[PDB]
Each structure stands twice: as structure tokens, then as C-alpha cells.
From TrEMBL, chain A:
The gene is env. Residues 19-132 form the Retroviral envelope protein GP41-like domain. This is Transmembrane protein gp41. Glycans are attached at N79, N86, N93, N105. The lineage of its organism: Viruses, Riboviria, Pararnavirae, Artverviricota, Revtraviricetes. Disulfide bonds join C66-C72.
UniProtKB/TrEMBL annotation, chain E:
HIV-1 lineages are divided in three main groups, M (for Major), O (for Outlier), and N (for New, or Non-M, Non-O). The vast majority of strains found worldwide belong to the group M. Group O seems to be endemic to and largely confined to Cameroon and neighboring countries in West Central Africa, where these viruses represent a small minority of HIV-1 strains. The group N is represented by a limited number of isolates from Cameroonian persons. The group M is further subdivided in 9 clades or subtypes (A to D, F to H, J and K). The CD4-binding region is targeted by the antibody b12. The 17 amino acids long immunosuppressive region is present in many retroviral envelope proteins. Synthetic peptides derived from this relatively conserved sequence inhibit immune function in vitro and in vivo. The lineage of its organism: Viruses, Riboviria, Pararnavirae, Artverviricota, Revtraviricetes. It is found in: Host cell membrane; Host endosome membrane; Virion membrane. Glycans are attached at N1, N12, N16, N41, N43. Highly glycosylated by host. The high number of glycan on the protein is reffered to as 'glycan shield' because it contributes to hide protein sequence from adaptive immune system. Palmitoylation of the transmembrane protein and of Env polyprotein (prior to its proteolytic cleavage) is essential for their association with host cell membrane lipid rafts. Palmitoylation is therefore required for envelope trafficking to classical lipid rafts, but not for viral replication. This is Envelope glycoprotein gp160. Belongs to the HIV-1 env protein family. The mature envelope protein (Env) consists of a homotrimer of non-covalently associated gp120-gp41 heterodimers. The resulting complex protrudes from the virus surface as a spike. There seems to be as few as 10 spikes on the average virion. Surface protein gp120 interacts with host CD4, CCR5 and CXCR4. Gp120 also interacts with the C-type lectins CD209/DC-SIGN and CLEC4M/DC-SIGNR (collectively referred to as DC-SIGN(R)). Gp120 and gp41 interact with GalCer.
Length: 132, 118, 112, 53, 43
């Protein structure tokens, strides 16, 4: 549309496009997650719930391979039973909503695999810096 | 005082996805424990299928089960479920949910005969 | 994996007389702390088994002291110094120190 | 900011935030009365007649 | 039917009480225990 050619606009703007197009615009959805006599309690619990959710996400990233790299290749493989689709098709064919509907079952095992991979990389790096 | 009770089929066709679910009362799931599945073919010895943990251990199975077993815990319902994809009629066995603790498998389930038949 | 063997495979008990099962594991079950993760079970038909002795010197809650257990290396020993009619079933020797968990074959025990 | 090629299911009847609007307006209506004067001494025997008409 | 030795644990008490209307008061009675009333100071 207006943002054709130079593919960007405001946050949640890429939510309709395919995930390959939406992957180039991730900094703003990361950005619009933190900043934004009894009603002060409501304002305060909203603000601390926002920073608690953001800190939980940053801690979930920080125990994995990437602290703030925002795109992280890692060392765990991919079971093809989970996706069971053509690989380059999903980046030109699927929205992130539809993809999250697809792998709703296949969740929370990936995160433990990531933690095992990161702890294995840490003990391997400890051994490597130990014998040197 | 822990009580484990299995639930699910006992008669399924081969080459299908088998799934049981054991309910747990008398204690909590997220304990120093491995909520485990152990089977026994009829007239034969036991066969340990695998476990899951109430902490954050990754579940570790018997490699003879050919990576078709996914035990999934349900802490919001105090349960933990066996899975077995692509079953055969030779997989007919009594199934048991149990709890490894500081002692070895104190409270079992009653154990139900899953007779895989076509 | 760990291989378990019980000897004898069948022993019809004489009431008033002891009985024994020698367990043989394939590998050393003594963990580096100093303990031994070995357990004994007793098959009842269509039932969860009855549990006699875990961690050989230790005792289950719910087990009378008319049993006994010892052992060296991989040769462990369950003994019943006074058998009863309540000792029906087919026993088990099962390790717990190595993944994967394994169990045994068992000793057949009936009335003589 | 507009969104394109996006289909969401709306439901105004099981919707939230109308309950929160009702609760907020009720609590605000209560919170704008606690400064004001209670009319406890006005409950009294009234000698009433018709208006001069 | 109280004996003179064992005193009545429950005392009946009648009193004035304001109604909802400020002009009108009512006479009303109730029961209370010995451990809640004292004798302010025939009648
Ligand atoms: C409830 O309220 C009424 C209304 O005021 C009270 O009654 C009044 O009590 C006073 C105090 O005893 C009475 O004054 C005395 O009356 C006696 C007997 O008539 C008289 O000999 C004395 O010289 C003195 O005037 C007053 O008459 C009485 N009025 C009525 C209409 O009974 C009452 O005491 C309050 N309490 C209870 C429990 O009813
Ligand atoms: C996810 O699992 C449920 C069972 O809980 C199943 O019915 C559903 O088909 C699965 N999703 C997909 C996409 O297969
Ligand atoms: C228990 O703790 C004591 C003191 O820290 C130590 O000496 C002992 O070896 C420990 N035992 C085990 C089995 O970890």
C-alpha cells in the first residue's frame, strides 16, 4: 500500500502479511511492549504486569542462546513431524496467527530442548576454556 | 496416602495412536518424583516405558520404545499421560502409572490390560 | 541396559522354613554417595506389586521385619527367614541407579 | 494504524470491557458522593399540603 | 421462677429508642446478659 516497496509501517502492520515479510519488521512489536486515589492501584498493577511480562520474556531469551539478538539461530534440530509442510512455502503462504495455530500442540517441549542445548553448550565451553 | 488411577482404553487397533491418562490424588504432582509409565506383557516380566518429572527434567524413555512414547504432564489437573503411536498386537500389556521417589515406585496405579487387537 | 537375574526361578516354600532369592545385576549399582539403588517387589495377580525391600538395608513403611536383605557387589540377597501364606506372588529385583530403569524375571512361590 | 488482510471474530455479547465500563462507572459514581452531605437529619415528620394552585 | 440464690443470667431491658423518623421515638425491650449491663446510680 503506502508502505509498498519499502516494506514497513507501524506496529502490528505486518500481522496480515506472510511471516517472511513480517520477519523484517520485528523491532517495533518488541518496542511497543514496555513503554506503551484508587485508580493509581490499577495504573500501577497494569505497569508492573507489563514489566513482569517483559522481564519473563527477556529471561526466557536470556537462558537460551540469545540475550538480545532478536533473531537466534540455535543448535536444536527440528522434528519434521511438527511442521510437516513445505519449508519455503510457509514464508510466502502463512501468517503468524495461522502458524501459531499450527504448532499450538508442539510447544513447551521446544523450550526444554533449548535449555538443554544452552546448558550443553555452556558445559562444552567450560571444558574448552578449562583444558586451554 | 498417594493414589494413582489409570484411565483410557484397553482395546485398540494396531497401527494407531494409543494414549492413557493417570489421575493422581493423595499428594501433588510437582514433587521430588518421576511420574512414570511401566508396562508388563501378560505372563512375562515388567517393561519400564518411561517417566516424566514434576520439576523441569526432560522426560527420558527406554530407547527400545522407538521414540513413539510421549509422556505429558498436566499439573493443572494433577495428571500425566502416556502416548504410544503406531501400536502392534504384540504391544498387549498391563499398563501401570507409578511414582519414583526417595523410595522406588511406592504408589502404583492398579494397572490395566491394554489388549491391542485388530 | 542393566540385566537382572533372580536365582532360583521357582521355589515352592515350606511353611516354617526360610527361602532366598539371589539377585545378579549386570553393572555395579553402588552410587558414588555410598548407597545402593536396588528394590524388591512381589507380584500379586492383576495387581500393583507388593514392595518388600528397597535400598537393601532400608525398609518400606508397611513391611514386617520377618524379611531380610544383604549383598555384595552385584550379588544381592533377599531372604524370608519365616515364610507365610501372605508371601504369595512372583518377586522382582529391580535397579534404580541407571537409566533406563529395568526389572527382573521373578521367583515362582506357591504352597508346598 | 490500519491492518490489512486480517480476519478476526468479534462478539459484542460475550465481550469484555463493557463489564469493566459498568464497574468503573458504578465505582466512579460512588466515589463522587463521599465528599457530599448525608441527609440523615432530613428524615422527619412532614406536614404537607397541596401547593397554592 | 428464679431462686434468690442463683441470680438470673438474663435481664430484660426496656428503653427509649429513636425510630427512622427523628421526631418519633419508640419504647422497645430486649434481653441482655449480666456481663453486659451495669447499674447506673426505689427503681
Ligand atoms: C421512654 O420514654 C418515655 C417518654 O419520656 C419515658 O417516660 C417518662 O419517664 C419519666 C421519668 O420517670 C417520667 O417522669 C416521672 O413520671 C412519674 C410517673 O408519672 C412521676 O411520678 C414523676 O414525678 C416524673 O414525672 C414520665 O412521666 C414518663 N412519661 C411517660 C409518658 O411514661 C420512659 O421512662 C422511657 N423509658 C422506658 C423504659 O419506657
Ligand atoms: C492438537 O492436539 C489435539 C488433541 O488435544 C488434536 O485434536 C488436534 O488435531 C491437534 N492439532 C493438529 C493441528 O493436529
Ligand atoms: C551430606 O553432607 C555432608 C556435609 O556437607 C557431607 O560430608 C556428606 O558427604 C553428604 N552426603 C551425601 C550423600 O551427599
Amino acid at each position: 500500500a503506502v508502505g509498498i516497496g519499502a516494506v514497513f509501517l507501524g506496529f502490528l502492520g505486518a500481522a496480515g502479511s506472510t511471516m517472511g515479510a513480517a520477519s523484517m519488521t520485528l523491532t517495533v512489536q518488541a518496542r511497543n511492549l514496555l513503554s506503551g486515589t484508587v485508580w493509581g492501584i490499577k495504573q500501577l498493577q497494569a505497569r508492573v504486569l507489563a514489566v513482569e511480562r517483559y522481564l519473563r520474556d527477556q529471561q526466557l531469551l536470556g537462558i537460551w542462546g540469545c540475550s538480545g539478538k532478536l533473531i537466534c539461530c540455535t543448535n536444536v534440530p527440528w522434528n519434521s513431524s511438527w511442521s510437516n509442510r513445505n519449508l519455503s512455502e510457509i514464508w510466502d503462504n502463512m501468517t503468524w496467527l495461522q502458524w501459531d495455530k499450527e504448532i499450538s500442540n508442539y510447544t513447551q517441549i521446544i523450550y526444554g530442548l533449548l535449555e538443554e542445548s544452552q546448558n550443553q553448550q555452556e558445559k562444552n565451553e567450560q571444558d574448552l576454556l578449562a583444558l586451554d | 496416602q498417594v493414589q494413582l488411577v489409570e484411565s483410557g482404553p484397553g482395546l485398540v487397533r494396531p497401527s494407531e495412536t494409543l494414549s492413557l491418562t493417570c489421575a493422581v490424588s493423595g499428594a501433588s504432582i510437582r514433587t521430588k518424583a518421576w511420574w512414570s509409565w511401566i508396562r508388563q506383557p501378560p505372563g512375562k516380566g515388567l517393561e519400564w516405558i518411561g517417566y516424566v518429572s514434576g520439576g523441569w527434567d526432560l522426560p527420558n524413555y527406554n530407547p527400545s520404545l522407538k521414540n513413539r512414547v510421549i509422556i505429558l504432564k498436566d499439573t493443572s489437573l494433577n495428571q500425566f499421560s502416556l502416548r504410544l503411536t503406531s501400536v502392534t498386537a504384540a504391544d498387549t500389556a498391563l499398563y501401570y502409572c507409578a511414582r519414583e521417589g526417595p523410595e522406588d515406585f511406592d504408589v502404583w496405579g492398579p494397572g490395566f490390560l491394554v489388549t491391542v487387537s485388530s | 541396559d542393566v540385566v537382572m537375574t533372580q536365582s532360583p526361578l521357582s521355589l515352592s516354600i515350606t511353611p516354617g522354613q526360610p527361602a532366598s532369592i539371589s539377585c545378579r545385576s549386570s553393572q555395579s549399582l553402588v552410587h558414588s554417595d555410598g548407597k545402593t539403588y536396588l528394590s524388591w517387589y512381589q507380584q500379586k495377580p492383576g495387581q500393583p506389586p507388593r514392595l518388600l525391600i528397597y535400598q537393601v538395608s532400608n525398609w518400606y513403611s508397611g513391611v514386617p521385619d520377618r524379611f531380610s536383605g544383604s549383598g555384595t557387589g552385584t550379588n544381592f540377597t533377599l531372604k524370608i527367614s519365616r515364610v507365610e501364606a501372605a508371601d504369595v506372588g512372583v518377586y522382582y529385583c529391580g535397579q534404580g541407579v541407571h537409566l533406563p530403569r529395568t526389572f527382573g524375571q521373578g521367583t515362582k512361590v506357591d504352597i508346598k | 494504524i490500519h491492518l490489512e488482510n486480517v480476519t478476526e471474530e468479534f462478539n459484542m455479547w460475550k465481550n469484555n470491557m463493557v463489564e469493566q465500563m459498568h464497574t468503573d462507572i458504578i465505582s466512579l459514581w460512588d466515589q463522587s458522593l463521599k465528599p457530599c452531605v448525608k441527609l440523615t437529619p432530613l428524615c422527619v415528620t412532614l406536614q404537607c399540603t397541596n401547593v397554592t394552585n | 421462677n428464679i431462686t434468690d440464690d442463683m441470680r438470673g443470667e438474663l435481664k430484660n431491658c426496656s428503653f427509649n429508642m429513636t425510630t427512622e423518623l427523628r421526631d418519633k421515638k419508640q419504647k422497645v425491650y430486649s434481653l441482655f446478659y449480666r456481663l453486659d449491663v451495669v447499674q447506673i446510680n426505689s427503681n
